[PDB]
Amino acid sequence: GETINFCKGWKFHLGDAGKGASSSSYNDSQWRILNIPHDWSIEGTYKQFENGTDWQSGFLPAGISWYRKTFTIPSKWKNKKVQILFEGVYLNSEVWINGHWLGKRPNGYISFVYDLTPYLQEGKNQIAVKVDHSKALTGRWYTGSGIYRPVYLLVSNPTHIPYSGIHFRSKLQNKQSATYTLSIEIETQEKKPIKVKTYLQAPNGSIADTSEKIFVLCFLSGSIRKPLLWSPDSPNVYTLICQLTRDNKILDECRLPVGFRQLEFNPVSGFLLNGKSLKIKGVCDHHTVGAVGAAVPDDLLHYRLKLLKDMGCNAIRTSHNPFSPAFYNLCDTMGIMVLNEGLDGWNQPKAADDYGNYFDEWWQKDMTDFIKRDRNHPSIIMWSIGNEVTGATPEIQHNLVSLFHQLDPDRPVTQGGTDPNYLDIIGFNGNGEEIGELEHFHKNYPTLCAIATEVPHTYQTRGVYRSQTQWRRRDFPAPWEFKHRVFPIPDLTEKECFPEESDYPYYQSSYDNASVRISARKSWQRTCSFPWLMGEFRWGSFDYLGEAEWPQRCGNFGIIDIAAIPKDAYFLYQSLWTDKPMVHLLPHWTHPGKEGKTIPVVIYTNCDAVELFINNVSLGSKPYTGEQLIWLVPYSPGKIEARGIKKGKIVATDCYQSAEAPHSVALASNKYSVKAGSDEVIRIEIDITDKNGIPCPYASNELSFHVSGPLRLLGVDNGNPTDMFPYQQPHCRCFRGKCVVLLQSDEEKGKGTLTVQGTKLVEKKLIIEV
């Protein structure tokens, strides 16, 4: 057998091509030619009303569209069974082979396979795919549209392991050894016996154990000495290799990643991994990645996960649906625990055309396929069966918890917004942020396990500051919108220092002072004060498309912007969640017009103390005892610098210089070599600089990109939540000084040059070897 990449060279038709588009004979020669993964939605035009979509779905186009592709069968595969794997299609896909209807599948986040074998022909075979997003309000966030994950042809001996057909389970015994069991489904038509062989390949490439078993499900038992345990700090991942053999000839092979670790959950001390207790420092994210929408290449996923990893984050919650195979594979190798969530609402829709409409009929097939796909990932520590569910019923809750308990007895089940029951772990959402709530749950339910599945909710825009506190309900209300129930956040100054920001009511402050109920810092301090609370998953890692009223294309929920540029809140978390000594200063020091006026300069740090300097004159030293450090500083232009001290030694610094008028750009790339024809991504971050190279924090200059050689544009973005612009054209305005361009290699080798230009700026060039 073999796995064939089936992404290249599909045909695509925006809009509904009609009934005929399923048949063999249809003429698709006028159709666009593209490669998948593909999100047609991220290719269109923002419209407030015309697209059908709204504040939740993110104002981009949906509707119906079609894909088609031709393939031929080699001679080698005359014997073979041939299937098609779709890792995901949003949504309501139907598929046809040589005219024959294979099925319709509503759920847009689930992987699925169809058997083509019985319908294959002499020469040329036709696939047609209809994606039906005509009922566009399918999510409380921007979803994307299309064949947004890869597609493969699974070509096997009639005797093979079906997709999702292996279940691996282990039990650790101290640290000397572990035992494990293997459940392997086998499809076959021939009665002669089969010798199943399996290998645990260690992270270093060596084979650490073998097990063998004759089959006529096939279940194996094995063990291993000193297995290398999986943790965030040490993501050891074994690769399980399983073969079906006969007369010592391999008939089928299947590989998957697995790992060894022990999970314990209790209501007194929380979570323990490998016997060592561990606070869960978590974030939620959605499946979409800004300028690329739902069709995310692995390199970009990697880039984002690594930014999370460097912030000190050790878990992500897949709000609120299954993610891609690639995501779980990278959490396994990178050391990020997952709370893997399968649903938002249940059978009452939350957005009018969402899975609500399909639940009663599809919940069981979907959730089974979900659990069977992901239950082997060592990264996954916990399941969620939904989130702020409306019309919840004990009957439905039991149906779900039992299914998960049955198909995976080795991990607990929670559900977001279930704070006061068939759950193993209560999940606190926003009410966990109100005064007294956590305490009152603990007094009253001291034997229940608890985790904050969505705490806290804070709002912030990159490069924007307000010295006075804003509260969402009064100052930036959500579309469905108390004093005594928030944790106070005092104003930084008596009078506002940035009154010019009142002209951007759709941007929130990047101090720790624009929120709903609680600061980021206070949330985390509280979570730490309660050993019984396993941890928290903040709402908003990356800003994500959708869920924002016009004229916003995205919300201010994340601590990193929609282009993957850290906001100050990123460094607030880094300062609380990591040990390596660091210090971070806010805001910048470019305040022309405000000479003499008070700027509140705020420090985040993990050092013992910090001393602040304006042009190397000391503004005084302050010890660090857990709060943010504030100095009120009269503005004079110059170099502002915070020095971080441990044990009397200065071990970290942060600074800013006052910028002059914009003059050129600084280019910074994550890579400078890229393999031709691959799907790698070059990410270039652009800063508008003055004549001495100091970044301009207020620059919004329009830029132009020019690529020569074998390089292609993938998308551009600036992080401005109220700027709507075509993502796949080489123009972009900067936002508070920055913007980002994503490049990929073309088909052929050579030397690649990006040039960046703007009116009244000196161009700069950047070379990428291919």
- Whether residue 64 is found in the same domain as residue 139: yes
Burial label for 174, CB within 10 Å (0-12, 13-18, 19+), is exposed
Phi/psi for 506 (5° steps) reads -100, 15
Q: Are residues 233 and 162 in the same domain?
A: yes
Residue 543 CA to residue 552 CA, distance in Å, equals 12
Statement to judge: residues 439 and 314 lie in one domain = yes
- Residue ending a domain, among 219, 239, 262, is 262
Pair 654, 548 in one domain: no
Question: Residues with catalytic annotation?
Answer: 388
Phi, psi of 744 (to 5 degrees): -125, 155
Peptide bond into 488 cis (omega under 30): no
Pairing type for strands 425-428 and 449-452 reads parallel
633 sits in which H/E element: strand 629-634
The tally of domains found in the chain comes to 5
Report the relative pairing of strands 533-538 and 449-452 from DSSP bridges. parallel
d(CA 180, CA 164): 18
Please give the method by which this entry was determined: X-ray
What does the alpha-carbon distance between residue 477 and residue 497 come to, in Å, rounded to a whole number?
A: 23
Residue keyed to tokens 């990178």: 334
- Tell me: do 525 and 412 sit in the same domain: yes
Distance CA 694, CA 709 (A): 31
Within 8 A by CB and 6+ apart from 369, the residues are 110, 111, 112, 164
User: What 3-state DSSP class applies to 574?
Assistant: helix
Looking up residue 151, the CATH number of its domain turns out to be 2.60.120.260
Quote the radius of gyration of the chain (alpha carbons, Å).
27
How far apart (Å, rounded) are the C-alpha atoms in residues 117 and 80? 8
- In the sheet that holds 151-156, the strands lie side by side as 2-5, 151-156, 81-86, 112-115
Q: Which two tokens stand for residue 628?
A: 């943010």
What is the distance between the alpha carbons of residues 321 and 377, in angstroms, rounded to a whole number? 16
Question: Kind and range of the H or E element at 359?
Answer: helix 359-374
- Dist. CA 382–CA 535, nearest whole Å: 13
CA gap 610, 628 in Å, rounded:
11
Classify 372 as helix, strand or coil: helix
- Resolution in Å, one decimal, please: 2.4
Which amino acid, one-letter code, is at 472?
Answer: R
Comparing CA positions, the residue from 567, 584, 598, 631 lying closest to residue 499 is 598
Last residue of a domain, one of 629, 660, 691: 660
Can you give the residue range of the structural domain that contains 131? 1-157
Q: Is residue 650 domain-shared with residue 695, that is, in the same domain?
A: no
What is the CATH number for 408?
3.20.20.80
Do both 656 and 676 map to the same domain? no
Q: Do 486 and 349 share a structural domain?
A: yes
- 353 with 484, same domain: the answer is yes
Pairing of strands 81-86, 112-115: antiparallel
Tokens found for residue 494? 């008596």
Supply 174's token pair: 């101290």
Q: Which of 561, 582, 603 is the last residue of a domain?
A: 582
Q: Are 186 and 72 in the same domain?
A: no
Reported residue count of the chain is 770
Tell me the DSSP string of 252-295.
EEEEEEE-B--EEEETTTEEEETTEE--EEEEEE-S--GGGTT-
Cβ neighbours of 309 (radius 10 Å): 15
**First-to-last CA distance in the chain?**
33
Q: Which residues pair with 41 in a beta bridge?
A: none
Residue 256 sits in a domain of what CATH number? 2.60.40.10
The helix (run of H) or strand (run of E) holding residue 304 is helix 298-310
427 alpha-carbon distance from chain centroid: 20
- Residue 257: exposure state from Cβ atoms within 10 A (0-12, 13-18, ≥19): middle
CA triple 665-670-676, angle to 5 deg: 110
- CA-CA distance, 524 to 530, in Å (whole number)? 10
What phi and psi, each to the nearest 5 degrees, are found at residue 731?
-130, 145
Asked if 253 and 322 sit in the same domain, the reply is no
292 close to 556: Cβ distance less than 8 angstroms: no
726 and 644 part of one domain: no
**How far apart (Å, rounded) are the C-alpha atoms in residues 417 and 451?**
10
Q: Cβ(13)–Cβ(128) under 8 Å? A: no
